[PDB]
């Protein structure tokens, strides 16, 4: 999955960004089973004042998380995932949940590429990884934080 | 809804951004009935020269509006909404409509979060808001511009 | 189509961006038949360190291509398109494919606007263009690079 996270300039310190990334990544891994290295958190920063709510320009305290996943999960699991991302980012970013927005977009796996290759159908990460060469596995494994 | 608006650096003044946000927000409210504070306009700015059309690098006069809505509206209402956003942004940004692109993405409400909570199924904004506490309502109401 | 391309600051030179745009644009045109001027490549740049994989902060060598298309193509054509974008960007950006991610989002044509007007249903670009005035055609034709 790829989580595009929209925030204002310097609202999240390098340290805060890592926490948020870990929170998002861990929540995903926990509720979906998908492997850590398969989840991306992309911070897109803009100047405070570029976000508008109901037409009222905001300050630097808004966070919009737009998640891109593979088709396949139930409404129940997605709801939990969303809820978990809200709680976890709230804590990780030290930001009240009222300031948090989250949208989930889904797509067919056969049209999703990570690490230059096609993702497996949900629940097949197993044989997908087994067929990979040790070079590609070693590379993917460098991208896992288990704190 | 969340309207991601991609434009070039300093093509829209703070003043022009507010106008556009109001135009987008008002159009949405008018054709969907959704409340003002429930609509977000997020300006994502990049240096002129980052947009390419047919392979030809552009200047600072392009605008791409990517709208994220809840599933449920008809093709007819969406078409009108899109058309309205084109006319209204054209006027608000003082930009010829030939320079305007608009895409609408839809998602199930049960996987969309605003103000830290789940959005209601279209046409239920009513009881959703009635169940909210006065603290959460007061907060949402600060984000409404009725000019 | 609109291809949002997320990269780190100064990882792609003006020259490299044009190559990538051409690669993306040409691949699209070749596998879909859609006209050059109808494809947009939008570079969204951020500071290196804003991308996280599995919770591990990355450097400036990641590329995420998020493509927005019209509903209608088969899984087979999309797969080929994706594969082609990976190979072609890899070459154009001089970046190993392991660093490349690609997602395709689809939407109904009747809710997609380019050059201020509604896109035609796939395979109708023909009469769509024939009904256009010479002013609008001349404008669109300036955005085509056939190198």
Strands of the widest sheet of chain A, in order across it, are 2-1-5-6
CATH class of chain A: Alpha Beta
**Oligomerization status of the protein chains:** homotrimer
- How many β strands of chain A by DSSP? 8
Q: Tell me the strand percentage band of chain A.
A: 25-35%
Largest sheet of chain A: 4 strands, mixed
What's the end-to-end separation of chain A, in Å? 20 Å
**Percent of residues of chain A in helical segments?**
25-40%
Overall shape of chain A = globular
Largest interface: A-B, 33 and 39 residues
Care to describe what's here?
Three copies of one chain form a homotrimer. With 147 residues, the first copy, chain A, is α/β, with parallel strands linked by helices. Chain A has one domain (1-147): Macrophage Migration Inhibitory Factor, CATH 3.30.429. Helices cover 36% and strands 27% of the residues of chain A. Chain A has four helices and eight strands. In chain A, the strands form three sheets. In chain A, strands 2-1-5-6 form a four-stranded mixed sheet, with helices on one face. Chain A has a two-stranded antiparallel sheet with strand order 3-4. The longest helix of chain A has 19 residues, at 14-32. Chain A is globular and about 50 Å long. In chain A, 44% of the residues are buried. Chains in contact: A-B, A-C, B-C. The interface between A and B is large, with 33 and 39 residues. β6 of chain B pairs antiparallel with β7 (112-114) of chain C, so a sheet runs across the interface. The PDB classes it as hydrolase. The entry lists the keywords 4OT, 4-oxalocrotonate tautomerase. The assembly is trimeric.
């Amino acid at each position: 999955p790829v989580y595009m996270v929209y925030v204002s300039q310097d609202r999240l310190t390098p340290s805060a960004k890592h926490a948020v990334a870990k929170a998002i990544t861990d929540a995903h891994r926990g509720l979906t089973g998908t492997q850590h290295f398969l989840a991306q958190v992309n911070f897109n920063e803009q100047p405070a004042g570029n976000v508008f709510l109901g037409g009222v320009q905001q300050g630097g305290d808004t966070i919009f998380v737009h998640g891109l996943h593979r088709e396949g999960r139930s409404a129940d699991l997605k709801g939990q995932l969303a809820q978990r991302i809200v709680d976890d980012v709230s804590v990780a970013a030290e930001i009240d949940r009222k300031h948090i927005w989250v949208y989930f977009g889904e797509m067919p796996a056969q049209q999703m590429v990570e690490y230059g290759r096609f993702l497996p159908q949900p629940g097949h990460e197993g044989e997908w990884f087994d067929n990979l060469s040790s070079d590609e596995r070693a590379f993917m494994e460098t991208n896992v934080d288990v704190s």
